[PDB]
């Protein structure tokens, strides 16, 4: 079990997990708020 | 040692040894194989236990007493999309305050036990268990009944995680059945009945 | 520098008029309710909208019917390049700061080289929220004299 | 020793000497002291700012909405004119006294003492200090001297704190309080009390 851990603490399978979640974001944000050319809210 | 295994004549694994109450050396991919996460996951294994008791109590009795004529109680499937006397939003929200507030406690006592269990406004309310997920006190034993010798408790607390386990399954049943079924439970429990050989998965 | 407001300019009010058109040619083949004339309506709506919030946030539009960015720092215009920098520096420094004191965290130990190539995750949980005061954090260290070295640099 | 979170121990340096020691800074924010010591008085200055402001934003929408007396929004005061206020020059004025007094509460704590040897006369005695930096009470500061500078300083500036840490964030909510409901603090209050179960911040999104 330590083992398995460890193994997914490399630091290539923490990319994959770490940028794939950053993917998500930024297509979810991009699917609700398109075309964002300015910053209008202040 | 001797104590009745998953399956029979097999070599359970070493870490369990059949202390903890429901082990019947059942860990085929030795998720439990360190003793840290064995001990969160008895955590995960006794609430989620809990939790469908009450989900199994929540979907089958009304099922059950709505298929006869006695009460009203509509589909546990399509319970949440029940407008109630406010919006489902915030009583979820609401929901998440009161269960984090317990979900909070309980998570430093796991984290570190004893640490919790003193009342902070009236501080004689202090409660009584010593095992952890096991509280205690006058709020969670209203006569004790947890207070007792071992080789009871042993038993009491099999009693408590065969039967959760017993719940788990269940609900999960009610979940599947409603989907590719078109009926409530009992429903897909009696026209099961009429032709046992005949309704089943196989239509 | 002349240019007029995407909100009167003919010429921008004229690409929205295409765009629309040139979706509403390749939806007059399919039929009246399948999926494709779904998609296809989606993209229309989609686009309608884009237009309007150009002509409405105020940007502002040349004779192409095209949006100009006004980086100079009139803030009449800042959600359009100051804002938006604003957002970024600071998620910037938050990525450089916290990685710095994951570098610094490791550093004390037998060998950092293992600590970097297999990532403790526990103590860079511990760490991630500390990049949220980053510009107070770092000001604090410039003005106390621990954010640079002076001449101690290879080895030690 | 009742910290903000039961289960978590507090850290090991804020003991607690400090009034308001409930062993709160997660992000590792006060770990050196020439830090914590000028981490200190920035929430003393900050909550006495925001104990006022927010009765002076409070207390004014109260009196005006119930008919006493007339005021605008502190939301619209900024605007506000009645004679010969160029908010112009009252800026500079307010910059030049408070930046008058604000450096000589800025030397004291980095030269303690160093602010009442001087030739200007007959008040060269009180702006010594208070003998704790935050709380520069003297025989003008304190003009009903009524402190023993020892005792009730772990039980009175416990109030203060407590004050001050409640009054801060009250102000906090005015600013987006305002910046959502356009609207008067007490005005969202008395909306909210109408219908609480209907005017939430879920409904007003
Ligand atoms: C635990 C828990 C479980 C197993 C469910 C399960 C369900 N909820 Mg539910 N909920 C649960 C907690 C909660 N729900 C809700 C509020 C809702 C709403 C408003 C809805 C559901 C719906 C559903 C269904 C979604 C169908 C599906 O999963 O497709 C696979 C399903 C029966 C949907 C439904 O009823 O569709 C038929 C739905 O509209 N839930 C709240 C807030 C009070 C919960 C709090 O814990
Ligand atoms: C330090 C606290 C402080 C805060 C939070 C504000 C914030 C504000 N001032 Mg303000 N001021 C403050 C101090 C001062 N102001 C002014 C001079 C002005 C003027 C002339 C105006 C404001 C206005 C405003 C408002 C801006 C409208 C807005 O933000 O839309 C969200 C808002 C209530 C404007 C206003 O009142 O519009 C309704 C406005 O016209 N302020 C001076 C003297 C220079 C101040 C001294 O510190
Ligand atoms: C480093 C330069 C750079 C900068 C400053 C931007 C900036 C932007 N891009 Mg962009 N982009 C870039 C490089 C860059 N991009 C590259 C290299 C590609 C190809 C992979 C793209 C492909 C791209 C797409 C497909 C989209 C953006 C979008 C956007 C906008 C983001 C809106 C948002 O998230 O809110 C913003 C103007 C979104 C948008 O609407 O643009 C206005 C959008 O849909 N970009
Ligand atoms: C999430 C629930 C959960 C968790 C955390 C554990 C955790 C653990 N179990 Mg366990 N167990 C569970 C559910 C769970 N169990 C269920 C539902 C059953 C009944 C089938 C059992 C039966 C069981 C036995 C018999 C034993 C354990 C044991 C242990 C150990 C994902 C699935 C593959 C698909 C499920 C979806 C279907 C059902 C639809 C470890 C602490 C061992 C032990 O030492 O007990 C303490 C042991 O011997 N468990
Ligand atoms: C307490 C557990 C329990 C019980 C009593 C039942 C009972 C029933 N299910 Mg069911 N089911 C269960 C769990 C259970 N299920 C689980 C966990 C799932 C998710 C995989 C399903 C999914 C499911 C579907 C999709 C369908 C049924 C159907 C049925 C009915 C006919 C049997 C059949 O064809 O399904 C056979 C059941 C399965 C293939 C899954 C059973 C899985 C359990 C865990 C196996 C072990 C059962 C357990 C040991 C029995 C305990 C003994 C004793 C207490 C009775 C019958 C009333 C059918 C129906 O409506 O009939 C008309 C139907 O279409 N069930
Ligand atoms: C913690 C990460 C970190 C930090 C704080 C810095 C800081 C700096 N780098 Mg840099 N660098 C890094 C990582 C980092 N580097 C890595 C991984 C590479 C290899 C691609 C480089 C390659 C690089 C070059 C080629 C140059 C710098 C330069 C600089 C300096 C100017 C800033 C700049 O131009 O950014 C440069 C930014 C980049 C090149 C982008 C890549 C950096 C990645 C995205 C950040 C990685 C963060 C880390 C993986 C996260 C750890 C999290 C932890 C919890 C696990 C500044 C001292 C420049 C310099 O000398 O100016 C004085 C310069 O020429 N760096
Ligand atoms: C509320 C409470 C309970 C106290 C309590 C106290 N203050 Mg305090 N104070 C408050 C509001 C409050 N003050 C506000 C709103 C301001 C700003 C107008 C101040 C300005 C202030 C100063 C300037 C001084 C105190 C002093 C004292 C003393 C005692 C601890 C004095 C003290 O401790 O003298 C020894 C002192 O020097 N406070
Ligand atoms: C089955 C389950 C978990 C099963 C886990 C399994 C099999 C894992 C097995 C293994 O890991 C071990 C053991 C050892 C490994 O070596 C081998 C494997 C095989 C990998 C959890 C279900 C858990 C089921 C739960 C928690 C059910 C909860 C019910 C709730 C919360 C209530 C819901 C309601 O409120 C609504 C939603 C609507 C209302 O109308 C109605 C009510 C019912 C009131
Ligand atoms: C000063 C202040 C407000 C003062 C208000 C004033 C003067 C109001 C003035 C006016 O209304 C009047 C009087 C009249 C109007 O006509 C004019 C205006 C101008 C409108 C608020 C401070 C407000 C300050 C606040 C709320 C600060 C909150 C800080 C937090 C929560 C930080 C927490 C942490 O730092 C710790 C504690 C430990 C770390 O480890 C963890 C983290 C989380 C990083
Ligand atoms: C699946 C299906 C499908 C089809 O369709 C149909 C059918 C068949 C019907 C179904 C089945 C089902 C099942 C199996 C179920 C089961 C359940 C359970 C087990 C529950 C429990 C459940 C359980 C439960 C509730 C439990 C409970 C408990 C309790 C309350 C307790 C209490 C108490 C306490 C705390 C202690 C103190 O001192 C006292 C008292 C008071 C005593
Ligand atoms: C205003 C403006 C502008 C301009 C600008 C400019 C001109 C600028 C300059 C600038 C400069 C001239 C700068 C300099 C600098 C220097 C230095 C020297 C820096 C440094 C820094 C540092 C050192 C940092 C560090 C860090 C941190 C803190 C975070 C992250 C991490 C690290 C560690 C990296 C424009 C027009 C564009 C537009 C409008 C606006």
Same mark, same amino acid.
């Given at each position: 079990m330590r083992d398995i851990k460890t193994y997914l603490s490399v630091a290539p399978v923490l990319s994959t997990l770490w940028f794939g979640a950053l993917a998500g974001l930024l297509i979810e944000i991009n699917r609700l708020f398109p075309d964002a050319l300015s910053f209008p809210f202040f | 040692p001797e104590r009745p295994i998953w399956f029979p004549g097999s070599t359970p694994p070493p870490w369990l040894d059949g202390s903890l109450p429901g082990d019947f050396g059942?860990?085929?991919?030795?998720?439990?194989?360190?003793?840290?996460?064995?001990?969160?996951?008895?955590?995960?294994?006794?609430?989620?236990?809990?939790?469908?008791?009450?989900?199994?109590?929540?979907?089958?009795?009304?099922?059950?007493?709505?298929?006869?004529?006695?009460?009203?109680?509509?589909?546990?499937?399509?319970?949440?999309?029940?407008?109630?006397?406010?919006?489902?939003?915030?009583?979820?929200?609401?929901?998440?305050?009161?269960?984090?507030?317990?979900?909070?406690?309980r998570w430093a006592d796991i984290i570190k036990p004893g640490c919790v269990n003193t009342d902070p406004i009236f501080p004689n309310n202090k409660l009584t268990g010593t095992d952890v997920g096991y509280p205690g006190g006058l709020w969670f034993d209203p006569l004790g009944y947890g207070t007792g010798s071992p080789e009871k408790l042993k038993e009491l607390r099999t009693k408590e995680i065969k039967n959760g386990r017993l719940a788990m399954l269940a609900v999960m049943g009610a979940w599947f059945q409603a989907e590719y079924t078109g009926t409530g439970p009992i429903d897909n429990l009696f026209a099961h009945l009429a032709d046992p050989g005949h309704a089943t998965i196989f239509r | 520098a002349g240019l007029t407001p995407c909100k009167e300019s003919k010429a921008f009010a004229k690409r929205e008029k295409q765009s629309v058109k040139k979706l509403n040619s390749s939806l007059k083949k399919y039929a009246p309710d399948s999926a494709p004339a779904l998609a296809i309506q989606a993209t229309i709506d989609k686009t309608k909208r884009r237009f309007e919030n150009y002509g409405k946030f105020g940007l502002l539009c040349g004779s192409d019917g095209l949006p100009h960015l006004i980086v100079s720092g009139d803030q009449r215009h800042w959600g359009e390049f100051i804002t938006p920098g604003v957002l970024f520096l600071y998620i910037a420094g938050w990525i450089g700061w916290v990685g710095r004191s994951y570098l610094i965290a490791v550093s004390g130990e037998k060998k950092p080289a293992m600590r970097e190539i297999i990532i403790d995750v526990e103590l860079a949980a511990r760490i991630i929220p500390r990049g949220f005061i980053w510009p107070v954090a770092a000001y604090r260290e410039l003005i106390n004299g621990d954010l640079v070295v002076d001449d101690a640099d290879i080895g030690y | 020793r009742a910290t903000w979170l039961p289960g978590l121990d507090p850290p090991a340096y804020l003991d607690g000497t400090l009034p308001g020691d409930y062993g709160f800074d997660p992000l590792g924010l006060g770990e050196q002291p &020439? /830090?914590?010591?000028?981490?200190?008085?920035? &929430?003393?200055?900050?909550?006495?700012?925001?104990?006022?402001?927010?009765?002076?934003?409070?207390?004014? /929408?109260?009196?005006?909405?119930? +008919?006493?007396?007339?005021?605008?929004?502190?939301? @619209?005061?900024?605007?506000?004119?009645? /004679?010969?206020?160029?908010?112009?020059?009252?800026?500079?004025?307010?910059?030049?006294?408070? +930046?008058?007094? @604000?450096?000589?509460?800025?030397? /004291?704590?980095? $030269?303690?003492? $160093?602010?009442?040897? &001087? +030739?200007?006369?007959?008040?060269? @005695?009180?702006?010594? @200090?208070?003998?704790?930096? +935050?709380?520069?009470?003297?025989?003008?500061?304190?003009?009903?001297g009524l402190a023993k500078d020892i005792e009730n300083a772990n039980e009175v500036k416990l109030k203060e704190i407590k004050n001050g840490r409640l009054a801060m964030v009250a102000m906090l909510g005015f600013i987006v309080q305002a910046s959502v409901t356009h609207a008067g603090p007490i005005d969202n209050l008395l909306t909210h009390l109408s219908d609480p179960f209907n005017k939430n911040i879920i409904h007003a999104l």
């Open positions: - | 059942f860990d085929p991919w030795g998720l439990g194989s360190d003793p840290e996460s064995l001990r969160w996951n008895v955590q995960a294994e006794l609430v989620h236990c809990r939790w469908a008791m009450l989900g199994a109590a929540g979907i089958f009795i009304p099922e059950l007493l709505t298929k006869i004529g006695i009460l009203n109680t509509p589909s546990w499937y399509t319970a949440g999309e029940q407008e109630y006397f406010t919006d489902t939003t915030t009583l979820f929200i609401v929901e998440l305050i009161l269960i984090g507030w317990a979900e909070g406690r | - | &020439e /830090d914590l010591k000028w981490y200190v008085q920035a &929430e003393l200055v900050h909550c006495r700012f925001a104990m006022a402001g927010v009765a002076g934003i409070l207390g004014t /929408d109260l009196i005006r909405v119930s +008919g006493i007396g007339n005021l605008p929004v502190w939301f @619209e005061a900024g605007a506000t004119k009645f /004679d010969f206020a160029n908010t112009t020059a009252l800026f500079f004025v307010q910059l030049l006294l408070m +930046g008058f007094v @604000e450096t000589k509460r800025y030397m /004291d704590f980095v $030269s303690p003492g $160093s602010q009442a040897k &001087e +030739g200007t006369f007959l008040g060269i @005695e009180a702006s010594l @200090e208070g003998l704790q930096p +935050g709380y520069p009470g003297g025989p003008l500061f304190n003009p009903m």
